[PDB]
């Protein structure tokens, strides 16, 4: 009966196990490359374009 909600800003240096059990993802703006790599890997349905969209989002979008 209890659920989590994790928030971070540098997801590379975060536990591999706490994400993988997350069933939904909200991605706002991310710039640092290594972070793009990691968040692209973990997240399945992400080809090159869905990654080319992260670093150009506006303020308030997601």
């Amino acid at each position: 009966g209890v659920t989590l909600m994790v928030v971070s800003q540098r997801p590379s240096e975060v536990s591999e196990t706490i994400f993988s059990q997350c069933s939904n993802f909200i991605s706002l703006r991310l710039t640092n490359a290594v972070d793009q790599t990691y968040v692209k890997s973990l997240l399945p349905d992400l080809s090159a374009g869905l990654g080319d969209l992260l670093p150009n989002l506006a303020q308030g979008e997601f």
């Binding site: 703006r29 150009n56 506006a58 303020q59 979008e61």
Partner: protein
Amino acid sequence: HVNFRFQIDTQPIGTLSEDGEFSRGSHSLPVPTEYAYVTP
């Protein structure tokens, strides 16, 4: 040099309106045959 050819690559950052703001992030796309300018 073959006349000459000069190339400049670029990566977009922002969108500057006419009123004079600076909204980060550019969801637009420029079309060819269109002009460029230097930063005053």
